Amino acid sequence: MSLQPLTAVNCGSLVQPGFSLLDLEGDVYLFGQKGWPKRSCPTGIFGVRIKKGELKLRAISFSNNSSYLPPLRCPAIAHFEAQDGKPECYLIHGGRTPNNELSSSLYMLSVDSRGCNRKVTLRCEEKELVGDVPSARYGHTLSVINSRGKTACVLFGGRSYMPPTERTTQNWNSVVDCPPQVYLIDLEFGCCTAHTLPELTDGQSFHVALARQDCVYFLGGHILSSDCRPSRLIRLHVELLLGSPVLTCTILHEGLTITSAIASPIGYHEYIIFGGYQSETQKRMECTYVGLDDVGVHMESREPPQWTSEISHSRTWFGGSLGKGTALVAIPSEGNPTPPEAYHFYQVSFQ
C-alpha cells in the first residue's frame, strides 16, 4: 500500500481516461487508445513495461487468422479461466468506438505464441450471438461463472444512448440506464439468453462485479435515474440446468458507495478495491479490502497510501489493475503551456 510516481519515457498521448488493462500470461496489455490505430501499431493494443519508474509501451500483433478490433472505450471485461478447450480467454464486449458509437459485437482474446524474441503474438475471434442478444451498451459488466460444472457468462448493467425511436438531435449525446434484464451466454455456442429479475428494478453502470464458484456479487451501483450510489451489495446465484439455467437473486444490507472502481486480485480471492469516486465530486480516497469466500464478502480497510497533494486535490482520476497487489492510476495534469503530457502516473503496490 505505497505509491510511486512514474514517467512515461515517450508515447504519453495515446492513453485516454477510459481504457482497459488485461494481464494475461506474464506481461500486461493495455487496450483502448485515443484516436484510431496509428500506423505505428495497426494492432491497437500495447504491451506495457515498468522499468525504474520508466513507462515503456511496445507494439503487439495478432495472427493472420485473427480478427482486427476497434479500440473500444470502456467495455466490459471477463477473465475466462484457463481451461479446455482454449486456455486462457479474455472476453470483451462491447465498449464505445473512438468514432463515438457503440458496438454490440463480442470479442474473445487469447495469446498465440512467443517470442521469438520475447515478443508476444495474440489472437482475436468474434462470436455471432444467437439471441436475445443485449443491444449495444457500455459501462456494463461481464463475468464468468462455473456451475455444475460448465462455464457460462453473465452480462448485466450499463447504459446506452436513447432508444432508437427517441433518438433526438438535441438529446443525441444523452444516455439512459439500460433496462435491468441480465443475459446468460455460452461461449459455445454463442446462444445468448435474456432473463428478468423482479428485485432489480433499475439499470446501473460502472458497478464493479465479482464472480466466485458460480455466484456473483455486485458492489458499487451508481445510477443516473435517481442520482444515487446505493452501497447495498447485490448477490445472485445461478445453477446451470439443461436447458433451464435457473437463477436467483438477493439483497445485501451493506456494500460500499464506490463508482468505477479499480479491483486488484492479490490472492486467489484477497481483493482490494482501490478507488473511484465516493460522491458526485468527492472522489474516494481510502482503500478497501474484501475477502471472498462461500461465506461471502468480508469487509475491512487498509491504510490509504498518502496521496500527494497533486492527486489528493485533483478533480478526477482513474486507473487499472496491474494485478497482484500492483495497480496503476493516472492524473489529468495541468500546464502553461501544456507539456502536453497531461497525465502523471502513480504505480501503487499492496504490501
Partner 1 sequence: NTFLSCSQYHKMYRTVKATSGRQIFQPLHTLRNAEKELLPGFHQFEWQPALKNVSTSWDVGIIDGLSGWTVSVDDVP
Partner 2 sequence: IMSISIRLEGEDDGITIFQEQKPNSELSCRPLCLMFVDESDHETLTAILGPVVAERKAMMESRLIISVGGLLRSFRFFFRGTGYDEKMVREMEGLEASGSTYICTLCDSTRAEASQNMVLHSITRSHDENLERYEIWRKNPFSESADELRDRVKGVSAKPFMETQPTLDALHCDIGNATEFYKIFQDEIGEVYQKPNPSREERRRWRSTLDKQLRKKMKLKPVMRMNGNYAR
Find which of partner 1, partner 2, none residue 121 binds, CB within 5 to 8 Å per kind. none
Which of 50, 58, 59, 97 binds partner 2 (CB under 8 A)? It is: 97
CB of 63 to partner 2, least distance (A): 8
Q: Does 169 bind partner 1 (CB under 8 A)?
A: yes
Per CB under 8 A, 329 contacts partner 1: no
Report the alpha-carbon distance of residue 127 to residue 123 in Å, rounded. Answer: 13
Count of residues interacting with partner 1 (CB under 8 A): 25
Which residue among 1, 56, 60, 66 contacts partner 2 (CB under 8 A)?
Answer: 66
DSSP 166: G
Q: At 121, give phi and psi (nearest 5°).
A: -105, 140
Per CB under 8 A, contacts with partner 2 among 121-160 are: 126
Q: Which helix (H) or strand (E) holds 344?
A: strand 343-349
Evaluate the omega torsion of the peptide bond into residue 337 and state whether it is cis, within 30 degrees of 0: yes
DSSP labels, 274-335: ---BSSSS-B--S-EEEEE-SS-EEEE----PPPPHHHHH-S--EEEEEETTEEEEEEE---
Q: Element (H or E) spanning 147, and its range?
A: strand 138-147
Site string for partner 1, 260-299 (x = CB under 8 A): x----------------x--xx------------------
- Binding-site residue total for partner 2 (CB under 8 A)? 27
* Binder of partner 2 out of 5, 9, 26, 36 (CB under 8 A): 36
Contact string (CB under 8 A) for partner 1, positions 186-225, x = contact: -------------------xx---------------x-x-
Assess 58 for contact with partner 2 (CB under 8 A): no
Q: Which does 163 bind (CB under 5 to 8 A by kind): partner 1, partner 2, none?
A: none
Alpha carbon separation from 139 to 6, 97, 200, 306, 313 (Å, rounded)? 28, 13, 17, 29, 26
Task: Quote the least distance from Cβ 167 to partner 1, whole Å.
Answer: 4
At closest approach, how far in Å is the CB of 318 from partner 2?
A: 15
Instruction: Look at the block and give the residue holding cell 445510477.
Output: 223
- What x-and-dash track marks residues 73-102 binding partner 1 by CB under 8 A? xx----------------------------
What binding mask, one character per residue, do residues 172-201 give for partner 2 by CB under 8 A, x or -? xx----------------------------
Does 37 participate in binding partner 2 (rule CB under 8 A)? Answer: yes
Contact of 254 with 202, CB cutoff 8 Å: no
Regarding 35 and contact with partner 2 (CB under 8 A), the answer is yes
144 Rama class: left (phi>0) / alpha (psi -120 to 50) / beta: beta
Q: How far is the CB of 124 from partner 2 (least distance, A)?
A: 9
Which residues sit opposite 297 in a β-bridge? 292
Cα 185 vs. chain centroid, distance in angstroms?
Answer: 18
Strand order in the sheet with 20-23: 20-23, 28-31, 45-51, 54-59, 2-8, 343-349, 326-332, 318-323
313 DSSP assignment: H
For partner 2, the binding residues (CB under 8 A) are 16, 34-37, 39, 42, 61, 64-70, 73, 97-101, 126, 167, 169-170, 172-173
